[PDB]
Design a protein around this ligand. Structure first.
Ligand SMILES: [Cl-]
Ligand SMILES: [Cl-]
Ligand SMILES: [Cl-]
Ligand SMILES: [Cl-]
Ligand SMILES: [Cl-]
Ligand SMILES: [Cl-]
Ligand SMILES: [Cl-]
Ligand SMILES: [Cl-]
Ligand SMILES: [Cl-]
Ligand SMILES: [Cl-]
Lengths: 456, 457, 457, 456
């Protein structure tokens, strides 16, 4: 009867496996009933989006908003404008957001939405007239206390603007219906730098536990990819804490440090200029002495081309770390990897690290954290943008970063201590932050659902 | 390319595109291609998780769906189906068709459909009750007298519509025509039971009037019905009221034919109703002496050829119950009017045979075939009037309802006729195609209205 | 003192006060002065910024307005006008008048009006479409089937009402009678095109009945119409159906008079319709031979004096199309019944001439003049029935609509009659004043209802 | 077509002029399109108000609510009950509130409303029955997240009470729909003293910049007018900071210090008693030694009768500073003027100071700040009353005054730095806080409107 939705089903069974591979259904058997119920969305909306192009021709796309789980809070998720998009994909991405959001500790449920509207080629007026056509239907199904959408692939500050304007004008209300907002109309500070800072802050704890405090980020070689605000802020934060950033990348190839020890803020700051007004990471080299410092390898990704590294922060795309690149890293002395990008690491890679972890005792293991724990920094700040809107206040950068810091420490700890309860490791084995985190998001959500009578 | 495969849906998008292309529409009206682009993606679809409890007290989980396909000509109008086959694909199939089927009536009704993969089979009334309750609590917010008026279908009959109506009213705190298929004393219409069958008869009546330029009635006419349920029963009765001879009925394992030069009497029909209730068969009548004569039972048979000289044929039992052979017998028996009470009762062969003879015989010497999409639209017509009555705050008399049912069936007929005359303009003297006419007319009415209202330009 | 100057509005507050004072109302009913105080300030006015995009992709900015003037007798009822002259002053003028005009009908309709200084001139359909869309997105929240039902007017016709209806439905997610002037297949009423002209005829019919104590019809009656558009056309047709002789039509540069002892035939009328479409003139008929005889063209002329011996006069072309001279010709030609299809078609001179002859000739020997405020109220009557039909969930037949139109025109007539008999009580034998009667009756009905409901005490 | 609305049109063109007289439409030409769009209200409501007098007779007034701009927040504005009132005036006052509110930095749009209902003569029961009749229509168009009205001429704590009661009873909701509320039902501390404190705090910064820190309020002669909570708190705050308050006034004439140096808190405190239970500033003199200290001049205003002053704080009425009084002040050595009252200073006066500023270099100039920046203190606190309601908390006086202090510093700076960008002055000329502030409110609002797609 039920359709085939491979990417969603993939993630259901890969979650389920981890709960079986634990003691959770022995202390708590009745939770199997919950997994039946969490896995079918509370509500899904699919609606037609008719809009006009600059030539004046009728166009039509599909809109979707998966409203998956609201046991811990209003639906929270993102809008993706990409021609790949469908329900299957949006339930997959939605399904994750539940547990991710739950690991924040803030009261936010999980959903996702978007369109197969393809930004590429389209003018700003086209985008503006699509965002308007989209939210005209969506508007009725969402709200400050019901569902707070956000940005994702295809939709940015630009689109969030147009979305929020049309909502405001339909609803006749100024409310925190969308996160990712501009400074002047309910944005939060630390939003651009949230996910990056959040990954670095998470790993700080990884290092501490693994090394019993013997090691920080200071004097560590950390491999980053990507040159958006994620890779940028991640890098900066590594520098502040006394660490050395060896690598950055763009879609056309990567830049590796090999004359001097690390990128300098200004070298990072100059790749930021290379991102605004188009331009490319490559441009940087061939210029003010950057020729000597840096090696450019077009077409490639840094994982192998970095030498002996300690920390790896994929901050570019999905599936940007394969089983080879994980084995490269292991062999390269890497001991710590989390994602700044969403699902940057492939299953193959996770499997390799999690095997390496089981087989190597103490600090000798490579430790991988999942996205649902390590790259929560941005959804956390979405949470605090919500909190600010409601307060009717803009907090200082100190305020937000402080709360982000407490939120990421508590995340790490929750995965650690859970894994130590349910996936209890062997003498001197590092507990699973994959299983630990998986269990922790399932159990917080599943419990609240029981409390509220969604299952019995 | 990214789109899910929905075989039922696109097996019908295609079917319609085929018709429209082949017609002369996209040549007078190229730009209506833009309408088929946009009509064919639902205005809104809702799917929602459905948690209900069984008699053992266990969490159960099914999926609920409400496809809200078109609202150009009126509120979403559709049905709920509870069957474990159900998914979006199927309900966008059914929903797409309800648009153009509803439109034919002439009433202000959009097109939609919904339901669950809840399986009524072997559930107790408590379980059904607890599921209808659990299901309407989410649906409630998306439907209404002026937004969406659902109804019954597979798995969803009077019992279920009651339980849906009760929960809606409870939650919304309002008493409105939010469902059709309701009880007598809480907003139902009379002629609901009799709606589809009287509809079929009323369609043919119009057919006869046109073809015979108003020089013939049903009066006298010898009518071959097949089936022995809602549709066959009331159809027969309507033929009798109008001075017609109902000459045949039919079952699964067996058929019934009259003594010749005669018809069934309402009581003999009323006796076939008692036979289906108590799950018995039609032979059971010929068992009794008073009908042992007056009727012949032929096991394993379909009446088309056993009847003799016949004028009207109303297949009303199952699909594919008329072969190309049986079509020819009818033609040669002098049959001139054949409409479906059943959906796709006639096979493509049969259709081509009638439509061939239509194209090669002029005027009312032709046999005329009408599709179920139109000839069977009484139920939906009365839904419409059940709506109208609930708003009027009134129960019309049986006569009032039947009379309005009759007028809605002319509107169906006429819509097809006119359309075929425009976009499949026949040779001089030849009856227009009501298959084609009726397959096109819903679209044109809807597409035009969507232009009028600016859903495409 | 602080109040803005709104010349159109207070040029009409004054006009009404004048009438009411001069009548005997504020002497039987002193306290109704308090009603004129409160009726004369709108219950609610909305004005809202209107940003829309043109075909070059540029921000455009106009002002939208919805004056919601009175709801004592029913939902706000009015029209949208898109004309660059438009402001609040004008729309409170038009809105104030709709109150008392609507009231005359006897139906439950309040009074309001809205629109923009958007100029339709030289805008493409996309631009209109994009403006209707932008405009209804703010309006949407303030209107509804039971709150405010807008319609068309200058700059706002069937095309625009479609685009408004589409956007409303889209936003509100409801299908209701939120506009009148709709398509045939999405909730329009038949007799909308024919509403005003049939209305004018139906008014006079009542006039004749009264004056001749039911001893005369339209049958035979020689009728002088002026104009050649919606109103003149359908008016003529209705006179013909009722056994009347339509003896004249008229244009901008020229008029048409019959051969004497004769009338126009529906086909000759149907041919004047083809002439206005394709922007041609009435002479163009006398060009053709079959009408070259049977009709005389007099360029630059108005029929009033060229017609001969006439009974009924229906000015239906422009304002101020009847002088005090032309009034006297009519009187001396034995004309006994004259109503306006056009607004202020008769000049004050003309009115005084009819009303003078009324006051100085007893009974149906008098010529009787009815104002457009009443005689032309068919369009608004059918709006009313378009509403009623949408709620009924039904399309009545043409006959049904026309019959109800006829009953609403008696209610208009009677309301004026009775009022004049009460508050401008005529000398014995003299026909009451339907100018005065019809200028008063809206107020009294509304003012009383507002007392009943406690908007004043 | 469009009607004539002189007071609104006056303010449109006087704003526009300042933007032309800048470099803004050269760096940002497309902003001319914004000024077209901001200038026509988003929504306006005019509704009949039928109410009964104590004699039992039907009465009727007009109600209005101009909801001008909501790009930065819910509509925020005030209700004025005055028989002068109409749309023109309410669009004028509304139009200002947009930019004023925007200069606060908090998320508040701009509107205004009220009636030609004349309080004067009317009993408390009449007022009560008018406020009730008014809000019965208004109620539907406003709300905690849509439009939050306030007090103005004609409407005070008294009326705000009656308004809030009828709202509550219609809406069945306790929410921050109105500011200016009583202590026990969602008022804020520092509300009475907000605008006064806000003007003084703003000037503190003026003095600092102009004198490079060489001078505070300490030992400065400051001329105030008015004796309501604005002039009172302004004065007190000057005293705390070590300044000398030379003048106060009422509608019947002013009181000038000339025996001793300054008013003492208790002399201020005693004029507060002269305001409750009616009474007059005059009363004070002729009594406990006040005869000697103070000179009373009935019929007059202090601007000329103060001697040599340093700071001027009009805190009484509109248009209470003419071109003569500005020339008096200049000649009297005044170097710093802002309004505690709404539009206290006339155009003539602004023109005179702004000329004097252009012609006199450095500290030698008189510096005028506009109301849209200097007297924001009250609308700021309206903002924080909103914030408190939402928090579900009453902050301490310290809390609110602290935030007010940060809000007024950031205002000043925003006008300074803007003016230095777009109205860049000549060597040693003090930048324009008129133009600086004008530009700053237009650009924050105009930008957010672009972000949200109100223009393109
Ligand atoms: Cl599944
Ligand atoms: Cl909804
Ligand atoms: Cl982010
Ligand atoms: Cl159905
Ligand atoms: Cl009948
Ligand atoms: Cl109208
Ligand atoms: Cl009639
Ligand atoms: Cl203007
Ligand atoms: Cl509203
Ligand atoms: Cl204040």
């Amino acid at each position: 009867n039920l359709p085939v939705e491979p990417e969603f089903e993939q993630a259901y069974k890969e979650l389920a496996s981890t709960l079986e591979n634990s003691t959770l259904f022995q202390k708590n058997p009745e939770y199997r009933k919950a997994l039946a119920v969490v896995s079918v969305p509370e509500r899904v909306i699919q609606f037609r989006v008719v809009w006009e192009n600059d030539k004046g021709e009728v166009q039509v796309n599909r809109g979707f908003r998966v409203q998956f789980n609201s046991a811990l809070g209003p639906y929270k998720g993102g809008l993706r404008f990409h021609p790949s998009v469908n329900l299957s994909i949006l339930k997959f991405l939605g399904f994750e957001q539940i547990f991710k959001n739950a690991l924040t500790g803030l009261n936010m449920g999980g959903g996702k939405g978007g369109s197969d509207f393809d930004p590429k080629g389209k003018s700003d007026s086209e985008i503006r007239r699509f965002c308007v056509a989209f939210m005209t239907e969506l508007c009725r199904h969402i709200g400050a206390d019901t569902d707070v959408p956000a940005g994702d692939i295809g939709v940015t500050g630009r689109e969030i603007g147009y979305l929020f304007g049309q909502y405001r004008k339909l609803r006749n209300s100024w409310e925190g219906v969308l996160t990712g907002k501009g400074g002047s109309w309910g944005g939060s500070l630390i939003r651009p730098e949230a996910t990056g800072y959040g990954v670095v802050y998470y790993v700080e704890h990884m290092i501490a536990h693994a090394t019993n405090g013997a090691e920080s980020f200071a004097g560590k070689r950390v491999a980053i990819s990507g040159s958006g605000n994620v890779a940028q802020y991640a890098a900066l934060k590594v520098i502040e804490l006394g660490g050395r950033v060896v690598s950055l990348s763009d879609s056309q190839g990567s830049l590796i440090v090999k004359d001097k020890d690390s990128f300098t803020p200004a070298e990072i700051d100059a790749i930021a200029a290379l991102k605004v007004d188009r331009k490319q990471i490559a441009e940087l080299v061939t210029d003010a002495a950057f020729a000597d410092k840096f090696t450019y390898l077009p077409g490639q990704r840094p994982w192998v081309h970095v030498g002996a590294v300690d920390v790896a922060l994929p901050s570019a795309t999905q599936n940007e770390v394969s089983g080879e690149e994980a084995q490269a890293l292991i062999a390269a002395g890497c001991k710590f990897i989390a994602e700044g990008s969403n699902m940057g690491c492939t299953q193959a890679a996770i499997d390799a690290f999690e095997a390496h972890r089981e087989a190597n005792k103490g600090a000798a293991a490579i430790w991988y954290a999942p996205g649902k724990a390590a790259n929560a920094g941005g959804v956390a700040v979405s949470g605090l943008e919500m909190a600010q809107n409601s307060a009717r206040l803009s907090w200082t950068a100190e305020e937000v970063d402080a709360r982000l810091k407490d939120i990421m420490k508590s995340c790490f700890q929750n995965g650690l201590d859970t894994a130590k309860e349910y996936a209890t490791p062997a003498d001197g084995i590092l507990p699973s932050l994959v299983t630990g985190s998986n269990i922790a998001g399932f159990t917080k959500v599943a419990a609240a659902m029981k409390d509220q009578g969604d299952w019995w």
